[PDB]
């Protein structure tokens, strides 16, 4: 899960007002390009490559009708409700699978940095970060539960596979700490971390490298 840089509000959200208007009315192709700018064609919660995708309200439209055409509440999630099929993580699972949850105790990735709450073990699991107590632990534990970031085998399997593929390159770089001097080695680590902006499951790959 990445810390996302939200910046500019698109023009179409000015027109539509809560109460009168419905999400069925608004055009979705108007909204996407700013989210694609924000996120980089990657899922907000799991960091899949987006292809089947939907606009996700972080607080849902039923419970919170105030936050229906508000730019802070919107996110590009993976999975497609329209298709005849079962999707079991992120936006779709938050509604259907997880069921009962407090919305306040979840990581909103535009506001908060995930890195302090979540840790990505190279065996493939996401866990609470080392040393959390009480409330911060509860947010980490519920973000993991409600977005189903372990419980989906497709996601877990895809994420493990990716990290395990690079672990030869991780071990080989840190051996050459010794013989290289600091300016050579710090340029190399910058160069590897440059690549993984364009890669799937980037936060998991980050924790493997650093």
């Amino acid at each position: 899960m990445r810390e996302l840089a939200r910046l500019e509000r698109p023009e179409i959200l000015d027109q539509y007002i809560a109460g009168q208007n419905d999400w069925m009315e608004i055009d979705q192709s108007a909204v996407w390009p700013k989210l694609t700018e924000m996120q980089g064609g990657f899922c907000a919660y799991c960091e899949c490559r987006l292809n089947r995708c939907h606009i996700e309200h972080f607080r849902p439209r039923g419970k919170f009708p105030a936050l229906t055409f508000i730019w802070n509440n919107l996110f590009g999630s993976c999975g497609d409700s329209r298709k005849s099929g079962g999707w079991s993580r992120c936006g779709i699972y938050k509604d259907n699978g997880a069921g009962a949850y407090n919305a306040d105790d979840l990581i909103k990735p535009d506001e908060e940095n995930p890195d302090d709450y979540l840790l990505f073990l190279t065996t493939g699991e996401v866990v609470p970060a080392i040393g959390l107590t009480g409330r911060a632990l509860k947010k980490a534990q519920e973000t993991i539960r409600v977005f189903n970031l372990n419980g989906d085998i497709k996601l877990f399997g895809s994420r493990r596979t990716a990290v395990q593929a690079i672990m030869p390159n991780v071990e080989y770089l840190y051996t050459l700490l010794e013989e290289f001097d600091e300016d050579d080695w710090n340029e190399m680590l910058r160069d590897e971390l440059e690549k993984i902006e364009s890669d799937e499951y980037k936060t998991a790959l980050k924790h493997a490298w650093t």
Binding site: T161, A165, I166, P168, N169, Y172, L173, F180, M188, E192
Partner: protein, 536 residues
Amino acid sequence: TKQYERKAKGGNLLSAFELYQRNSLVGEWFEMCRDYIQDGHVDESGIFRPDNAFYLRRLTLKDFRRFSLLEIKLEEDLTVIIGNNGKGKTSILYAIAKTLSWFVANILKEGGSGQRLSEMTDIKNDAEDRYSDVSSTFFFGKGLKSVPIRLSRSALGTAERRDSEVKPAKDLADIWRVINEVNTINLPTFALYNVERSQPFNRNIKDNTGRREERFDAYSQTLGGAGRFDHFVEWYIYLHKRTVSDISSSIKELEQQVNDLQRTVDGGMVSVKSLLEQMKFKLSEAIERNDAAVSSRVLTESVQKSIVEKAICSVVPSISNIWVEMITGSDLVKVTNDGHDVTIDQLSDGQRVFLSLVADLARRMVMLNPLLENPLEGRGIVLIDEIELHLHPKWQQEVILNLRSAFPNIQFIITTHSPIVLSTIEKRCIREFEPNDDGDQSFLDSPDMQTKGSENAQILEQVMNVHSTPPGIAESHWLGNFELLLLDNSGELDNHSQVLYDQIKAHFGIDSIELKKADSLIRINKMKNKLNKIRA
């Protein structure tokens, strides 16, 4: 004698029993035998454990079928036999089943005969000695560490006959039979489940003659290979009807009818005397059956029902509930399968076959272990051929765990060709069957690799000698070829390596494992070259 007394006081079961038989301190010796069989403890996990366990330790086959000599050591809990040659694996299970027939026969009837080896099919065709032996050694606590049994058969016209040696098995079975006759005890379960268990279910179910209610019906057709799922259904419906009915109300009603009929005969109607005698007989029979049921110390039908239902629901993942519906003057067993209420005949073949196995086994255990709080914690030996038959991979990952949890004291001897099943089992439990061109093999080996908790891909390669990728597909070799090309061209993408890279990308996709591995190779080789240049 004094010697038998010493051995018996030392804890020898056979000596104690011999003293019991001769004197029939008769009560003391009886109690010693009964305590040897019945004593046990509850472990830290809350599971009952007999103090004196019963299991098959060793099996030897000599000039039997394709085997000149084969020796197998079995585990107390679980042994799994693996290999291509399924016709030899099945021969091993058959040999065991025939031996187990001797215990079953003698528990049922004094001097009962088990099954014998065939002169035509069981003797190896090129046997110099022209005879076959199946030797088995059983264990029954520290008092009886070795119970040897040998089944033998000679060819026709041999100068000397080869007789079976079965007396130890008969002696042990006699202890169970005789002690049980005096005071009800728990008895061992023996069952074989072959590939035959996959048969279509005949729906129309037979009227209760009441053989299915008898305790020793648990041994009926127990080593036949299919089990009797039809008998389960009959027995289960019977249990249901008894639970809905009041018990001894028929006796009370019969008592009232006999009293009314007695008054009529006392009032001068001598014509109804014949009917009174018939009804008195019916009453006496009902009381005797009730008393025999009372004397057999058997569990209430309600409790029996509950135990079996729980067992089925626990072991069979798709089944959350099982019950009897009374419709159209015809009782139907229904199940809740994947949240939907269906008849047994509406179940998938995989679900039905597995249900049948567990249902049959649970029925037999409940009938044979009436004195245990959990009758499924009884003793016994169960043989299962091709346990993965009809099961999806997800079920294969749970089947052994579920069985072993539901039946914690049963010795399971099973065959499989599933790496997924093997991933849940320790290598000590695994015996590999790699025969020669003649079918002959001397010992069965544990694999070198630990299987329990290993990845299935590794088991495929290291245990089952199967590649992770299908060798007869070209695309299976592209990553290997790609790597070779990279290494040949000092780590730089040449025209040939680039073409293949593009092919991999086009075929497997941008987010494929294969492409990521290729990308990794590029990155590592580029870094290796940079290091080489710095060093130069």
